[model samples]
Target: DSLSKSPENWMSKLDDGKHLTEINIPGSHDSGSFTLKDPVKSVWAKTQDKDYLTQMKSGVRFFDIRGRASADNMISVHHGMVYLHHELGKFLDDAKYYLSAYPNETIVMSMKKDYDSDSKVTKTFEEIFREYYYNNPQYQNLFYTGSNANPTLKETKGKIVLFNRMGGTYIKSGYGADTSGIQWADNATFETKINNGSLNLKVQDEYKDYYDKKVEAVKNLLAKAKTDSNKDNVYVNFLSVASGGSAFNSTYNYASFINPEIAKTIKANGKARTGWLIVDYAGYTWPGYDDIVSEIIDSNKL
Candidate 1:
């Protein structure tokens, strides 16, 4: 299925018993930063070329959504202080609509507290988060509030699995506490675990002043996932790194260099689990290579 890519509904082909941790999920690094119109912000901030729904339709199951909870009880998507898009409520609506048409698909969204979004919010991040979900009864059915840190595909199909990157008294309150949990420490580097301690995550995410080490980091993690014996483990390999190459050598340039290179490694290892290969410039093809998302999906040979 190299050329026979399933971009729209890949999960429908996977086994229902496969756990989220065991699947080769194509993920977006900054899932909500695709709408930047300004040249400077687009160059420096935008991590995804496709919008959220399009990313899902294009086979992106894991989403890195950093947002700020407001006094209005809304979740605003942001990258640092720059506002990336409309409130997250709208995206959930879109997910609901998409899931209605494709019930076999599920999305894992990582919700983090944006340090700054330039919006005035008097309430704590925890309070606003509860308010947003509690008052909006429409969203309860849309979320997977299970107790298992890693849910089986049968349980999460047609739902949004919350990967909470924040914590509070709300930790056990039927939140993403059920999904995977790591405090996002080590600056998004090499290892973490799930909330219930049922799974181990080998994450290679680093934002350094220089990115020469990125390719090796990606390959190292890829190699690990290729032969990892533990069925309960997850590998999160990030190919999205920015090193102030400015507008000329921004995130897109990093993607161009890294994507095709790793596609070979992924292609070479037939049916090896890739965990979650999070990337930037998501759907773009680097000339002759196959789509990375599709390549990841192709590995799902059951």
Candidate 2:
């Protein structure tokens, strides 16, 4: 069944059979990069056409949030610009809305400051997380308190798994929020950077700048992840792209190409074991865009 129509706890279907780590999870890359303030000109900077609540309804269990610090000392989802005003609280509310209503599903989030160069910005982001997310009564228990070790859906149900990208030191102090913070695996070894953003793909010659390289890179990575799929380690591949226009575009790689290609790969792989595949412009970008999620959900049956 499609996640859009499936039960809120649709994930619970696999709760008894698979651990959260063993299953393939569908994620949105730069999930909050779109805007309603200026639709036409914003397409270039938009990575997702749908809002947070819509993404959750469409079966996206993982969210990649680039929280940026404003000069006013507030942290908001930043994608080079503040397209959306809602900050950490807004994000938590989105997750809480889905989990509260469904009661059977789980949400995983990866949060980091957009510009980590400034120590003050990072501190502001961390402070907001503590006040709105970690300290807030409504959100405190929603975290998965288990170790980084794999845990079944039963353990993580109705909880949020926060992946710490900044480092372990901040999570280690007071209240000890690190209890629920998962260890980030080595990016150099575990995560493979596929072709992303048109800037990197843009070159002197048009022939050398073909987008097929990005497609092929993802295909190979998915195959490798399928072969290496396991409980102890994690794998991540990004489907985000960027190009030029009135506004900077994030999914400039064009979902028409990447979405279909990834869907085809998932079908060819047979088991939908694509690990953590993060996509750009998900939801309404193309027909059956949720095929990626369907494949991962189907893998549990095998």
Task: Please tell me which predicted candidate would have the highest TM-score against the true structure.
Answer: 1
lDDT of each: 0.75, 0.59
Kindly report which residue stretches of model 1 are placed more than 4 angstroms away from their true locations once superposed. 1-4, 117-120, 169-181, 209-211
- Tens digits of per-residue lDDT, candidate 1, 1-302, equal 64226677888888888888788889898888888888777777888878877888888888888887644567788887888767887678888888888899888877778764336777766566656763369877778866666688899988888766766435452223643446455545666666566667678887652566888878778788877757678778888887474777788877876777777778888888777899887887767876677778787767
Candidate 2 deviant stretches above 4 angstroms:
1-8, 36-41, 71-73, 116-124, 172-210, 244-253, 285-290
| Residues 1-302 of candidate 2: C-alpha lDDT, one tens digit per residue | 64324634558666444665566777887787755356563565566777888888777888888876653345667765443556766778888888988777888787766754234454456766656566578777877756434556677778887655433324532211343333334221233211111011100111122367666666666776677645544556665555444332324446667676777667666665566667766654455553555555455433
RMSD vs true structure, all candidates: 2.5, 7.1
**Model 1 CA RMSD to the hidden true structure, in angstroms:** 2.5
Q: Could you tell me which residue pairs clash in candidate 1?
A: none
* Least well predicted 10-residue stretch by lDDT in candidate 1: 172-181
Give me the candidate number with maximum lDDT: 1
Provide the lowest-lDDT 10-residue window in model 2. 197-206
